[PDB]
């Protein structure tokens, strides 16, 4: 229903999370 | 959706955490 | 039901943790 | 059912999370 | 429980994250 | 259903983040 873009906005968050992690990993070298 | 409500709060918290990770990464360089 | 309530709490923990990381980041600058 | 101690083991995790945060906050002074 | 399965994976990840936060705290002192 | 799948992914992100924090902690020691 409208728990449907619940999951959509969470999927975006998870993606932002991944980009952020990648940047930190790269800083740790 | 109530449950949906929670998932929206989670997504927003996740984004903020991701942005904090980026600030950490930049402080390292 | 109680699952909803649990996920809200995870959300607050992540938010509080974000704040702490900003502080750490600032300390690492100087 | 046996999503019942699902939530129980998650409640414990959340508590560990809080203790960990408190210790970091205290280190940041 | 499958959904229950996920919640168990989450709890374990949360614990590991909490323990990493403590290691961070101790490194500061 | 798809909620289950989503929560699994959060779990992996938290696990990967934990590793990164251990590395940061080690770097802060020296």
Numbering used by the authors:
A (entry chain C), B (entry chain B), D (entry chain C), E (entry chain B): 1 to 29
C (entry chain A), F (entry chain A): 1 to 30
Article excerpt on this structure:
Here, we describe variants with all combinations of the aliphatic residues, Ile, Leu and Val, at a and d to give four classes of peptide: the ββ class, with a and d = Ile or Val; Lβ, a = Leu and d = Ile or Val; βL, a = Ile or Val and d = Leu; and LL, a = d = Leu. Peptides are named systematically appending the one-letter code for the amino acids at the a and d sites to “CC-Type2-“; e.g., CC-Hept becomes CC-Type2-LI. In summary, solution-phase data and X-ray crystal structures demonstrate conclusively that different classes of Type-2 coiled-coil (CC) peptides—i.e., based on abcdefg repeats with predominantly hydrophobic residues at a, d, e and g—adopt a range of distinct states.
Specifically, we mutated the centremost Leu at d (position 17) to Glu to give CC-Type2-IL-Sg-L17E and CC-Type2-LL-L17E. However, unlike the parents, they had accessible thermal unfolding transitions. Both transitions were pH dependent with stabilities increasing sharply below pH 6–7.
